[PDB]
Amino acid sequence: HNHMKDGPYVSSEEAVAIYTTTVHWLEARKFSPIPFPSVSYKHDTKIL
């Protein structure tokens, strides 16, 4: 209830700085984003 009333404690500039830090780190390591699990994707059954 106090979070609903007193707003997001993470201020907007803090969230933006954290987001841009994550963006710069992830492009620096050339990270390929995880796709949705496709329809066929054989490994599915083993993962299941």
């Binding site: 609903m4 009333k5 707003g7 997001p8 993470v10 907007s12 933006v16 987001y19 841009t20």
Partner: protein, 49 residues
């Protein structure tokens, strides 16, 4: 609820869009160097040939 939530969300959305734009520019900038480098190597090979 507090108003700051809206401002919070707005910032993230703009930040997200900005990041994507920057990435795209850097990405396309990179490929320019890539093809330029390829051309240079090809030219060198032609000279060597």
């Amino acid at each position: 609820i507090n108003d700051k939530f809206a401002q919070f969300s707005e910032a993230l959305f703009m930040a997200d869009r900005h990041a994507r734009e920057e990435v795209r520019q850097r990405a396309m900038m990179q490929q320019r160097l890539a093809e330029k480098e390829r051309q240079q190597k090809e030219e060198h090979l032609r000279q060597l040939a």
